[PDB]
Design an enzyme around this catalytic site. Structure first.
Site, PDB file in Angstrom:
ATOM      1  N   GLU A  79       0.806  -1.223   0.000  1.00 14.47           N
ATOM      2  CA  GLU A  79       0.000   0.000   0.000  1.00 14.47           C
ATOM      3  C   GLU A  79       0.837   1.271   0.000  1.00 14.47           C
ATOM      4  O   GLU A  79       0.312   2.312  -0.391  1.00 14.47           O
ATOM      5  CB  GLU A  79      -0.939   0.011   1.211  1.00 14.47           C
ATOM      6  CG  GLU A  79      -2.009  -1.069   1.133  1.00 14.47           C
ATOM      7  CD  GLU A  79      -3.071  -0.903   0.039  1.00 14.47           C
ATOM      8  OE1 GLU A  79      -3.150   0.221  -0.583  1.00 14.47           O
ATOM      9  OE2 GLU A  79      -3.850  -1.871  -0.136  1.00 14.47           O
TER      10      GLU A  79
ATOM     11  N   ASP B 182      -6.269   6.450  -4.871  1.00 13.42           N
ATOM     12  CA  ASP B 182      -5.818   5.076  -4.993  1.00 13.42           C
ATOM     13  C   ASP B 182      -5.902   4.600  -6.440  1.00 13.42           C
ATOM     14  O   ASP B 182      -6.209   5.396  -7.331  1.00 13.42           O
ATOM     15  CB  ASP B 182      -6.604   4.170  -4.048  1.00 13.42           C
ATOM     16  CG  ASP B 182      -8.053   3.878  -4.361  1.00 13.42           C
ATOM     17  OD1 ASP B 182      -8.521   4.283  -5.447  1.00 13.42           O
ATOM     18  OD2 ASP B 182      -8.737   3.214  -3.487  1.00 13.42           O
TER      19      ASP B 182
ATOM     20  N   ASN C  18      -7.168 -20.021 -10.504  1.00 13.52           N
ATOM     21  CA  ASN C  18      -8.528 -19.517 -10.452  1.00 13.52           C
ATOM     22  C   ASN C  18      -8.515 -18.076  -9.925  1.00 13.52           C
ATOM     23  O   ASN C  18      -9.284 -17.238 -10.400  1.00 13.52           O
ATOM     24  CB  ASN C  18      -9.360 -20.406  -9.540  1.00 13.52           C
ATOM     25  CG  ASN C  18     -10.809 -20.037  -9.529  1.00 13.52           C
ATOM     26  OD1 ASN C  18     -11.312 -19.420  -8.581  1.00 13.52           O
ATOM     27  ND2 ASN C  18     -11.498 -20.388 -10.591  1.00 13.52           N
TER      28      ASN C  18
END
Ligand SMILES: c1ccc2[nH]ccc2c1
Ligand code: NA
Ligand code: NA
Ligand code: NA
EC number: 3.2.1.17
Length: 163
Positions: free
Chosen positions: A11, A20, A132
């Site tokens: 972050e 962001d 996946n």
């Protein structure tokens, strides 16, 4: 390495309001302020969060305080979620950090889209789960971060966060 160091890498740390990756006003270590396009609405959220009139700037200590609250709240949300708790509890501590990382980024509502991945992780089919997990908006929009989180689920090591 631990969840705090991991999310701090993913972050960053900024002491002024920024946008962001999704365009949303944010501060500190990935603390989302609002989805509103109003900068005034974001500055108001920030003042409420810190408890003073900040004018859109905070200190490092304040950023770390919000971060600690945010990580805690993420995990406590997982443990209150009937769908997420059993998968989380099935995981080892390294993989639990990867799960918190996801919730921190996308929320419980984002993670709701990963039912089939979560099943594969509960089954400990790590390579299948990794494949996946990458079939996602998440992966396509933040691929380098998703690759690091996915490697963590695949391997159960911190190799993606070293160096
Ligand atoms: C709880 C919350 C988020 C998750 N992401 C992958 C597994 C998992 C469990
Ligand atoms: Na923060
Ligand atoms: Na934060
Ligand atoms: Na890793």
């Amino acid at each position: 390495m631990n969840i705090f160091e991991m999310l701090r890498i993913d972050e960053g740390l900024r002491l002024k309001i920024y946008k962001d990756t999704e365009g949303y006003y944010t501060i500190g270590i990935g603390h989302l302020l609002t989805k509103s396009p109003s900068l005034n609405a974001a500055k108001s959220e920030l003042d409420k969060a810190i408890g003073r009139n900040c004018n859109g700037v905070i200190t490092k200590d304040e950023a770390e305080k919000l971060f600690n609250q945010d990580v805690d709240a993420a995990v406590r949300g997982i443990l209150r979620n009937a769908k997420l708790k059993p998968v989380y509890d099935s995981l080892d501590a390294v993989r639990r950090a990867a799960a918190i990382n996801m919730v921190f980024q996308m929320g419980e509502t984002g993670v709701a889209g990963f039912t089939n991945s979560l099943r594969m992780l509960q089954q400990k089919r790590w390579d299948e789960a990794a494949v996946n997990l990458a079939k996602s908006r998440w992966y396509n929009q933040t691929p380098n971060r998703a690759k690091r989180v996915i490697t963590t689920f695949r391997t159960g090591t911190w190799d993606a966060y070293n160096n």
